[PDB]
Swiss-Prot record, chain A:
Function description: Inner membrane hub protein that plays both cAMP-dependent and cAMP-independent roles in twitching motility. Regulates intracellular cyclic AMP (cAMP) levels through the activation of adenylate cyclase CyaB. Plays an essential role in a number of virulence mechanisms including type IV pilus (T4P)-mediated assembly and twitching motility as well as cAMP-dependent virulence gene expression. Also mediates type II secretion (T2S) of lipases and proteases. In addition, mediates the cAMP-independent localization of multiple T4P structural and regulatory components to the cell poles.
Protein name: Motility hub protein FimV
Organism: Pseudomonas aeruginosa (strain ATCC 15692 / DSM 22644 / CIP 104116 / JCM 14847 / LMG 12228 / 1C / PRS 101 / PAO1)
Subunit text: Interacts with FimL. Interacts with DgcP.
Disrupted gene: phenotype observed: Mutants are incapable of twitching motility. In addition, loss of FimV dramatically reduces the levels of the PilQ secretin multimer through which pili exit the cell.
Subcellular location: Cell inner membrane
UniProt remark on domains: The N-terminal domain binds peptidoglycans through LysM motif. In addition, this motif is required for PilQ stability and multimerization. The cytoplasmic domain contains three discontinuous tetratricopeptide repeat (TPR) motifs involved in protein-protein interactions.
Lineage: superkingdom: Bacteria
Record lineage: Bacteria, Pseudomonadati, Pseudomonadota, Gammaproteobacteria, Pseudomonadales
Curated annotation (Swiss-Prot), chains B, C:
Disruption phenotype: Mutants are incapable of twitching motility. In addition, loss of FimV dramatically reduces the levels of the PilQ secretin multimer through which pili exit the cell.
Domain remarks in the Swiss-Prot or TrEMBL record: The N-terminal domain binds peptidoglycans through LysM motif. In addition, this motif is required for PilQ stability and multimerization. The cytoplasmic domain contains three discontinuous tetratricopeptide repeat (TPR) motifs involved in protein-protein interactions.
Species, as recorded: Pseudomonas aeruginosa (strain ATCC 15692 / DSM 22644 / CIP 104116 / JCM 14847 / LMG 12228 / 1C / PRS 101 / PAO1)
Protein name: Motility hub protein FimV
UniProt-annotated location(s): Cell inner membrane
Function, as annotated: Inner membrane hub protein that plays both cAMP-dependent and cAMP-independent roles in twitching motility. Regulates intracellular cyclic AMP (cAMP) levels through the activation of adenylate cyclase CyaB. Plays an essential role in a number of virulence mechanisms including type IV pilus (T4P)-mediated assembly and twitching motility as well as cAMP-dependent virulence gene expression. Also mediates type II secretion (T2S) of lipases and proteases. In addition, mediates the cAMP-independent localization of multiple T4P structural and regulatory components to the cell poles.
Subunit structure: Interacts with FimL. Interacts with DgcP.
Amino acid sequence: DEAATKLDLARAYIDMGDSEGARDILDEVLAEGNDSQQAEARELLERLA
Amino acid sequence: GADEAATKLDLARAYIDMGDSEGARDILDEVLAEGNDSQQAEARELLERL
Amino acid sequence: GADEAATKLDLARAYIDMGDSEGARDILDEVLAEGNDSQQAEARELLERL
């Protein structure tokens, strides 16, 4: 699943302090993921905000 | 196809973030084969910076 | 040290979700050598699941 992969990649960016990169990837999840994946993405986005 | 290239572009840039140019290189090669015109152009730019 | 291992652990999870177990194993091999006890433990758990 591409959305689930991007969620992990977003977490990897967050590890490296690349917040802008993580943000853009989490936006891809919003577009690609199912409802629960969108939820997870928004959770991480808020944590950045 | 293009949705796989989007994933691989994210992966490759993660490798650049880490400083692994060689790792990025192998993946960017797959973006060149999989991605749309826009994604191929991004891959080419990144490859030239490596 | 533990920051790079944490990043690699998430990258490994990404490879697994891509169905790329071979790539995940190569990355996890690095976590085993680089990570703290907790990170190593997670790498082992991921490897045994794969």
